[PDB]
């Protein structure tokens, strides 16, 4: 019905928080994913930029 | 509920729900069969009356 | 601690008769892995051991 | 089946199978008990006949 692209940059460690049902620095204060989230978390290295 | 966060708790609670609901269904099925036995005995007693 | 034990000789410091605050240990997030088994990292502050 | 890959689908389908099969077993058990009640009533009506 719609697609929403949510865009940001984080440590390659803290990427492990971006999933439904998680906690931590990013999950707690920056970006929280709902328990019934439908979607794809797409992330890639950007140490070139 | 005092000890696990939601997505981890939900697995545990679904186990409890499943087994408690199977305990209830067992109780109510045995009560339907006991109810038929007493129903027969009440019909007999009404005939004897 | 300045220097840790060798993992063959892992050291068990007993912590007891004290008041804790595990949100200091968690949310300060100088760490990298924080797997909590059987207890949530968050409800951990709401519980006694 | 339109939305999850096979191995993730199989867990969800096994949940649906479990609940639907429990619903069917409950139906058929209540029908066996109803059948016994109607059988007793038919036997009585054959006696009254």
Swiss-Prot record, chains B, D:
It comes from the Viruses. Subunit of the fusion protein that is processed upon entry into the host cell. Mediates fusion of the virion and cellular membranes by functioning as a class I viral fusion protein. Contains a viral fusion peptide that is unmasked after S2 cleavage. This cleavage can occur at the cell membrane by host TMPRSS2 or during endocytosis by host CSTL. In either case, this triggers an extensive and irreversible conformational change that leads to fusion of the viral envelope with the cellular cytoplasmic membrane, releasing viral genomic RNA into the host cell cytoplasm. This is Spike protein S2'. The chain holds residues 981 to 1029 of 1273 of the full protein.
């Amino acid at each position: 019905t719609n697609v929403y692209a949510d865009s940001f940059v984080i440590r390659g460690d803290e990427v492990r928080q971006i999933a439904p049902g998680q906690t931590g620095t990013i999950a707690d204060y920056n970006y929280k994913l709902p328990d019934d989230f439908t979607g794809c978390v797409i992330a890639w290295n950007s140490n070139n930029l | 509920l005092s000890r696990l966060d939601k997505v981890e708790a939900e697995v545990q609670i679904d186990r409890l729900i499943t087994g408690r609901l199977q305990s209830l269904q067992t109780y109510v099925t045995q009560q339907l069969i006991r109810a038929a036995e007493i129903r027969a005995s009440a019909n007999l007693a009404a005939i004897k009356m | 601690a300045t220097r840790f034990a060798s993992v063959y000789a892992w050291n068990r410091k007993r912590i007891s008769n004290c008041v804790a605050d595990y949100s200091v240990l968690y949310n300060s997030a100088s760490f990298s892995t924080f797997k909590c088994y059987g207890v949530s990292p968050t409800k951990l502050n709401d519980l006694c051991f």
